[PDB]
C-alpha cells in the first residue's frame, strides 16, 4: 500500500477512550467523490484492543468544521473486542456515496479501553491476502 499523509483520517490514533478522529478531511465543494471510478479506503485496526467492549466506527459527514449535525455513511456496528485485532476492517472497501461537505470518524466506545489504535484513511489500492 502507498497510503499517504493528506487524505488520511487518523495515523495510529489510540482512541482508547470515546474519542473521535483528528484529521477531519474537509472539502469546500460537495464532490461526493465515490461516484465513477472508485477510491479505496481503510478503517483497519492497526494494533490490538485490550479492555474495550464495542467500537462503533461511524463515518460521520457534516456541513460545518464542527459537526453540528452529522450524517452517517458507514457504521461497523458494536464490534466486540474479541475481533479488534490487527487488520480488522471496520467498513466497506471503496468510498461510499453521500460525502456532503465535511468528513470525520467517530469512535463511540462502550466503556473505556487500555489499548487500541486504528489507521483510518484513503488508500491508493487495497491489500488482500
Amino acid at each position: 500500500m502507498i497510503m499517504d499523509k493528506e487524505n488520511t483520517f487518523s495515523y495510529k490514533q489510540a482512541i482508547t477512550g470515546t474519542a473521535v478522529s483528528t484529521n477531519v478531511i474537509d472539502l469546500g465543494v460537495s464532490r461526493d467523490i465515490g461516484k465513477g471510478v472508485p477510491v479505496p479506503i481503510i478503517i483497519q485496526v492497526v494494533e490490538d484492543f485490550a479492555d474495550a467492549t464495542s467500537l462503533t466506527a461511524t463515518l460521520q459527514t457534516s456541513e460545518t468544521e464542527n459537526f453540528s449535525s452529522a450524517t452517517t455513511l458507514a457504521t461497523s456496528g458494536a464490534v466486540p473486542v474479541a475481533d479488534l485485532t490487527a487488520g480488522k476492517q471496520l467498513a466497506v472497501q471503496y468510498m461510499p456515496l453521500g460525502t456532503q461537505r465535511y468528513l470525520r470518524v467517530n469512535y463511540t466506545v462502550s466503556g473505556t479501553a487500555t489499548a487500541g489504535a486504528v489507521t483510518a484513511g484513503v488508500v491508493m489500492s487495497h491489500q488482500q491476502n
Binding site: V29, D32, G36
Partner: protein
C-alpha cells in the same frame, strides 16, 4: 392453444396482393418519425466498465501577491460521473420452408425486417426519451429522468441538473416537455459497449435446425436484430428542458410557449458561445402550438404579430433561432408532473 409464435400461412397471405405476389407496398400506419435516432452521435465506449466523464467542480482562488510575500498553492477540484449502456435485441424464426414457398423471398424478408426495425426504433426512441433505470433496472438512462427536478427560484449560473429545467403550469394530466440536446463528442453521444458494433445491428443467421422437445426437427431461418447504446449527457450545460407543458392550456394558448422557449436558449447558455451540433425535439402538438403562435387566428388575447392578408396561412415552424426543430413520435403528451427541487 396458440399460433402467434412465428409467421404462418395467414400472415403471408394477408401480406400478398390480388396479383398473387408479396407486396412491395405495405402502408405502415404504425410507423413513426424518430429523428433523434438519426441526429445522434455514436462513439465506442473504450474506457472500460462503462464510459466515464470528469466534471470540474471548483477552481483556485488566486491572491494578489504583495512583493516578498508567499502564495499558498491551490488545486483543481474535479469530480467524476460514469454512464452505462443497455441492450435491445429481437429475433424471428420463419419456418424456412414457408419463406421458400412464398415466391418473393427477399420481399417477404424485407417486409418483416422493416417491421422489426421500426418497432425497435420506436422502443429505442421511447426509452431514450423516458427510460429511467431507477424503475426498470436493465435499461439505460434517458434525458428525462436525469432532469426530473426544476429549481423553483432559479439562481443565475450555479449550473446544476435542477438549474436547466424551466417550469410553467402543468400539474394536471396534459403535461409534456421540450428538449434541447447538443449532439457532439464532448456534448452527448451514444455509447456502444466496447467490442459491440455501432448502431442498430442485423445478423442474417441463415438456416438452423430447431430441435423440438419430442424429437421433432425441421429447418428454420433466424434473423437477429441487436442494438445497445447510452446517451451519457457529459455536460448538462449543453441541455435544457421545459416541463409541465399543459396541453389543454398549450392549445388554448393560456401559457406562452415562446416565453418559455426564450427562457431556454439562455439557460442553455451554449451554442450561444461554443459547442457542436444542436437540435430541438418536441411532438406534433407542441409544434402545432408554435405554428399557431407564429400565424395566429383569434388567439386568446394578444399575439403582437400583424401579418398580411396573404400571410394568414402560415408555414411550418422549422428552424427556431437556427436550431432545426425536429418532430419525434416519442415525447408523450401525458408526462409526469416534474416537481420543484425546493
Amino acid at each position: 392453444t396458440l399460433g402467434n409464435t412465428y409467421l404462418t400461412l395467414a400472415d403471408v397471405q394477408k401480406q400478398k396482393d390480388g396479383k398473387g405476389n408479396v407486396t412491395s407496398e405495405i402502408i405502415e400506419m404504425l410507423a413513426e418519425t424518430n429523428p433523434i435516432l438519426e441526429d445522434m452521435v455514436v462513439m465506442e465506449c473504450n474506457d472500460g466498465t462503462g464510459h466515464l466523464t470528469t466534471i470540474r467542480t471548483g477552481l483556485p482562488q488566486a491572491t494578489w501577491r504583495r512583493l516578498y510575500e508567499g502564495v499558498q498553492p491551490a488545486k483543481s477540484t474535479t469530480r467524476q460521473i460514469k454512464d452505462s449502456t443497455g441492450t435491445l435485441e429481437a429475433w424471428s424464426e420463419v419456418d424456412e420452408k414457408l419463406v421458400k414457398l412464398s415466391k418473393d423471398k427477399q420481399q417477404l424478408m424485407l417486409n418483416e425486417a422493416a417491421a422489426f426495425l421500426e418497432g425497435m426504433n420506436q422502443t429505442m426512441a421511447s426509452t431514450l426519451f423516458y427510460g429511467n433505470t431507477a424503475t426498470d433496472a436493465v435499461k439505460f438512462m434517458g434525458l428525462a429522468p436525469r432532469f426530473n427536478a426544476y429549481r423553483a427560484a432559479r439562481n443565475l449560473k450555479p449550473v446544476d441538473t435542477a438549474d436547466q429545467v424551466i417550469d410553467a403550469g402543468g400539474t394536471g394530466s396534459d403535461l409534456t416537455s421540450i428538449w434541447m440536446v447538443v449532439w457532439g463528442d464532448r456534448t452527448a453521444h451514444g455509447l456502444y459497449p466496447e467490442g459491440t458494433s455501432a448502431g442498430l445491428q442485423r445478423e442474417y443467421l441463415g438456416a438452423e435446425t430447431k430441435e423440438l422437445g419430442d424429437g421433432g426437427v425441421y429447418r428454420v431461418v433466424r434473423e437477429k436484430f441487436e442494438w445497445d447504446l447510452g446517451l451519457t449527457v457529459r455536460d448538462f450545460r449543453y441541455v435544457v428542458r421545459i416541463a409541465n407543458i399543459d396541453v389543454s392550456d398549450l392549445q388554448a394558448g393560456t401559457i406562452d410557449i415562446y416565453a418559455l422557449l426564450r427562457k431556454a436558449y439562455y439557460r442553455l447558455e451554449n451554442r450561444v458561445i461554443t459547442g457542436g451540433r444542436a437540435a430541438l425535439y418536441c411532438n406534433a402538438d407542441v409544434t402545432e402550438a408554435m405554428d399557431a403562435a407564429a400565424t395566429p387566428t383569434s388567439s386568446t388575447t394578444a399575439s403582437y404579430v400583424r401579418l398580411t392578408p396573404m400571410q394568414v396561412d402560415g408555414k411550418e415552424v422549422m428552424m427556431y433561432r437556427g436550431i432545426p426543430v425536429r418532430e419525434c413520435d416519442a415525447i408523450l403528451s401525458t408526462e409526469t408532473a416534474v416537481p420543484s427541487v425546493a
